[PDB]
Amino acid sequence: SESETLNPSARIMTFYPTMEEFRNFSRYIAYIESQGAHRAGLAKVVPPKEWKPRASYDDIDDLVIPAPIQQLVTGQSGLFTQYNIQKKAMTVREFRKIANSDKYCTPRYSEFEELERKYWKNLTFNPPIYGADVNGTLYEKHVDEWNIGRLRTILDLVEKESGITIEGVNTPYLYFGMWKTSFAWHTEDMDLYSINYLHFGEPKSWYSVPPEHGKRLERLAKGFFPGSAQSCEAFLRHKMTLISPLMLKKYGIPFDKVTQEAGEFMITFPYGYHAGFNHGFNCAESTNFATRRWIEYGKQAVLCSCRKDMVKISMDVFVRKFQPERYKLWKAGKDNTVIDHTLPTPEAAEFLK
Ligand SMILES: O=C(O)CNC(=O)C(=O)O
Ligand SMILES: [Cl-]
Ligand code: NI
Ligand SMILES: [Zn+2]
Numbered sequence: 001s002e003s004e005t006l007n008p009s010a011r012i013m014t015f016y017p018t019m020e021e022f023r024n025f026s027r028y029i030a031y032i033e034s035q036g037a038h039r040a041g042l043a044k045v046v047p048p049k050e051w052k053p054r055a056s057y058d059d060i061d062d063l064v065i066p067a068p069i070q071q072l073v074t075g076q077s078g079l080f081t082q083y084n085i086q087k088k089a090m091t092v093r094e095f096r097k098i099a100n101s102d103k104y105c106t107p108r109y110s111e112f113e114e115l116e117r118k119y120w121k122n123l124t125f126n127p128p129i130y131g132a133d134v135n136g137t138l139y140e141k142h143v144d145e146w147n148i149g150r151l152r153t154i155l156d157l158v159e160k161e162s163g164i165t166i167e168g169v170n171t172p173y174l175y176f177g178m179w180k181t182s183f184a185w186h187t188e189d190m191d192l193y194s195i196n197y198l199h200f201g202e203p204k205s206w207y208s209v210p211p212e213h214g215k216r217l218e219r220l221a222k223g224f225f226p227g228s229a230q231s232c233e234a235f236l237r238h239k240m241t242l243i244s245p246l247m248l249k250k251y252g253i254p255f256d257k258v259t260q261e262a263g264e265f266m267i268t269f270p271y272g273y274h275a276g277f278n279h280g281f282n283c284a285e286s287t288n289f290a291t292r293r294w295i296e297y298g299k300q301a302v303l304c305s306c307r308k309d310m311v312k313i314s315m316d317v318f319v320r321k322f323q324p325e326r327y328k329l330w331k332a333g334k335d336n337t338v339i340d341h342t343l344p345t346p347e348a349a350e351f352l353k
Helices: 023-035 092-100 110-122 154-161 211-224 226-231 245-250 294-300 314-321 322-331 346-352
Strands: 013-015 042-045 069-076 078-087 129-135 173-177 184-188 193-201 203-210 241-243 256-260 265-268 273-278 283-288
Touching: 013 023, 023 042, 023 294, 023 346, 092 129, 092 226, 092 294, 154 314, 184 241, 203 211, 203 245, 211 226, 211 241, 211 273, 294 314
Parallel strands: 013 042
Antiparallel strands: 042 265, 069 078, 069 129, 078 241, 129 173, 173 283, 184 273, 193 265, 193 283, 203 256, 203 273
16 A cells, blocks of 8 residues: 555664644644654654754752662573662752763763674663653753644643643653663553653664564563463553663564664654664653544554553543544443554645655
C-alpha cells in the first residue's frame, strides 16, 4: 500500500519545518506521519532557528530536584539491568557541580562511535546520578508553538473527562542528565506518543526499533530475562532493561540510532521501543501525547501486571467518541481489529491528497 511505500526502510527521519508549519503541532505530526516517519518509531524535528521557548536558563541553579536517582547497572555481554537508588533531594547547582566533577564528567573522544563504545564499556562502573522525573516545565507561559505543557492533543480527554492527572504523561517532566545516565528500552505508557525537547547541555543519544518489529525485540528480551518475563508480561515497562546495539545486530533486530542536540525535538511513536543515554550535563523536557491512530494501540497495549502503581488509562471515552460503531463490540471482548503499524494517522489524510 501507499503507506508501505513511504519510508520503506523505516529509518529515523529528520524534519526542518518552517515557522508556519511549526505552528500547529498535531497537524505537523500528521504531516511527518504522512511521510512515513512513524515507521521508525522515532523522529527528529529541528525547530525554526527563529524559535526559542525560554529567554535565559540562568535562574535554574536554585530549582529543586526532589528525588535524584543513582543508576547502578549490572550485567555483561551487552545485557544489563539498571537499579535506581534514590538519593537525597538536591538543587540544580549541586547536581551540576557533581556532574562536572572530575569523577562524573564526560570523557574525551573524537567520533561519536568512540563515545558510544566508551558508554557500553563503562556502563556498570562509577554509577552516575540522573535528575529524572522532575515535575515542571521550562517553557515561558506565552510560547504557543510546541508547548509541552499544553499541546492540545486528544490525550487531554483523560483529564477533561475524569480530572485525572498522570505526572509525566499528561503533565511535563524535566530530566537533568549527566554523563552515562541512561534510559532503558521501553515504549511509552499505554503505548502513547512522547515528545522530548532538549533545552540545553550536551547531546542525548537514542536507539529505536521500528514498531513493526517491536514484538521481535520483546521475544529477544524474553529469552534473555526469562525470570522477569515469567513474573510480568510487560517487564520492559519497568524500564530497567538495557540491551546494546551489538546484541540487537547479533540477533537480527532492526534498529536505528540518532543523536539529539540542544534545541532539538524527538518524537517517539506508539509502540516504538527506544533507549539511550546522555553525553553529559543537560536538561530535557518531555511528555506524552496522542492522535486518533493511538486509540487502537491504547486498546491493545500490554500492561505491567506485577506493580499496582503502573499507569493505566481508561480507553472507554476514546472508543465511545472516536469508535462509536465498535464500542459495544469492544466492551464484549470481540473487537479483533489488527493494527497496521505502517498506516499514518487519519488526520494526515489531507497531506496525503
Ligand atoms: O529523557 C529520557 O531520559 C528518556 N526520554 C524518553 O524516553 C522519551 O522522551 O520518550
Ligand atoms: Cl531473568
Ligand atoms: Ni520514552
Ligand atoms: Zn511488571
